[PDB]
Amino acid sequence: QVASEYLGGPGGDAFDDKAVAQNGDITRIEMQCTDVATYIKLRYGKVDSRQWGWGNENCIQWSKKGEKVVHELSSGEYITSAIVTYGKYVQSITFKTNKRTLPRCGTSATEKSVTVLIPGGLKYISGRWGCRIDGLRFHAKC
Amino acid sequence: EIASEYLGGPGGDAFDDKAVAQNGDITRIEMQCTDVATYIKLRYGKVDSRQWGWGNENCIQWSKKGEKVVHELSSGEYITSAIVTYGKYVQSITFKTNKRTLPRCGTSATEKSVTVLIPGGLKYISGRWGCRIDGLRFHAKC
Questions:
Q1: What are the φ/ψ torsions at residue A43 (nearest 5 degrees)?
Q2: InterPro entries from the entry (chains A, B) (predicted)?
Q3: Spatial separation of the C-alpha atoms in residues B129 and A117, rounded to whole Å
Q4: 3-state helix, strand, coil in chain B (%, to 5)
Q5: What residue in A sits closest to B2 (Cα-Cα)?
């Protein structure tokens, strides 16, 4: 399927949710949010991906941890855009669906910004992670 | 049908390539390019749409004209994304295919930018036009 540019930096380890996405449409967005977004974990059907970010508690040296946020999506609800601010890491993430505008994860939005539109809805994400979210790529449904 | 939202302003006249797209998958992109994109004209199989933009040569009384640009797509190459800057009009357009990012049409990229993913490849465009490209909507094959 069509995918966006990779947004972020070259650090961290690669992740790619193509396989876990076989379980279903995205039904839920879980993130950890402080002045920046420190992890993302989508639910595909009833199956979560792994926690992409906040590799371990020693990461508190390099950023705050943040609050666990959970946005449940209804059946037929899908993510139609993502506004990402990023430098060497993803700084903040704002998702919009065909029903809702979700709050920004990451109170700071000072880095360069990109708006990715995903007609028909996001299928899954890939990117890089470690203590935080090094980068993201958005994969469309076809 | 999956399609993007309409990007641009309310001027000019609507156009819609839905009917002409029955002639085939997109095989070529023709645009006219200066500081802004002043027309677009796709080829569907062997058949072109009308020229959407630069309605007449007296348009030089409001904007620059630009030079003709043609991108020929290979068989099995399809348009997967467009980076569009826009306000009252479409300002610049950067197409990407499943094989390559193409050159931007319109050297000025200062207005609101979005990266439109076009799932399964672009099937056809609709929009509005006059002396320039008042707006665009991308209709995906999938």
A1: -105, 130
A2: Jacalin-like_lectin_dom, Jacalin-like_lectin_dom_sf
A3: 23
A4: 5, 50, 40
A5: A120
